[PDB]
Amino acid sequence: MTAVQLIVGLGNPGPEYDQTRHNAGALFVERLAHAQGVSLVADRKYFGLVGKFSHQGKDVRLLIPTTYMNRSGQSVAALAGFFRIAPDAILVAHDELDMPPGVAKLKTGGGHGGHNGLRDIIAQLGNQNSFHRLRLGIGHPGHSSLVSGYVLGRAPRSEQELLDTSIDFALGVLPEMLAGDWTRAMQKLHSQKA
């Protein structure tokens, strides 16, 4: 119904954070960009890395903010505002504590669940939460006190691999996501198993 015009992948910038769990969304957008032969260009105007490709006669943009995670909204709002992109045409990929490694799910709207990247995006988009999310499971450490260290850590190999698998599964439903056929994307995706 509403074609996706912007896919955002959340993560923290720079070497200490690279390959950390909290960068799951960025990894997805990096994988996507490589698979589609899209270059991600560093563009200070959008506070991130930005790429573009054409699908069905429309430009689709890829964005990896290079703000810190808590200021990701600044990047999304810059780019979506400049191109007059409505929240309903945005997909945000992010790490999801509430699903284990190997599981990816889609969701439309709702809250941030304490994800401070999502929280900033909702805030910056003028309290619009009606964007779509690709939730990439990273597991939960099992107490709230452990969550900061966990998301900012490098998962062991087994969990990294399972994340990669769930990213492949989500790439499998790219055609649906781009078209905005969230119902079909969800049936296909939510039916997979790592």
Q: Is 46 annotated among the ligand-binding residues? A: no
Looking at the structure of the chain, the number of domains it has is 1
Evaluate whether 20 touches 152 at the Cβ level (below 8 Å). Answer: yes
Which long-range contacts (C-beta less than 8 Å, at least 24 apart) are formed by 82-88?
A: 82/45, 82/46, 83/5, 83/6, 83/59, 85/5, 85/6, 86/2, 87/125, 87/128, 87/129, 87/130, 87/131, 88/2, 88/130, 88/131, 88/132
Angle among Cα 165, 91, 95 to the nearest 5 degrees reads: 45
Q: Is 23 annotated among the ligand-binding residues? A: no
Q: What is the CATH number of the domain that holds 61?
A: 3.40.50.1470
Resolution in A: 1.5
Active site residues: 22
User: Determination technique for this PDB entry?
Assistant: X-ray
Q: How many residues does the chain have?
A: 194
Residues 6+ apart with CB under 8 A from 187: none
For residue 87, give its domain range: 1-194
Q: Is 17 annotated among the ligand-binding residues? A: yes
Evaluate whether 52 touches 82 at the Cβ level (below 8 Å). Answer: no
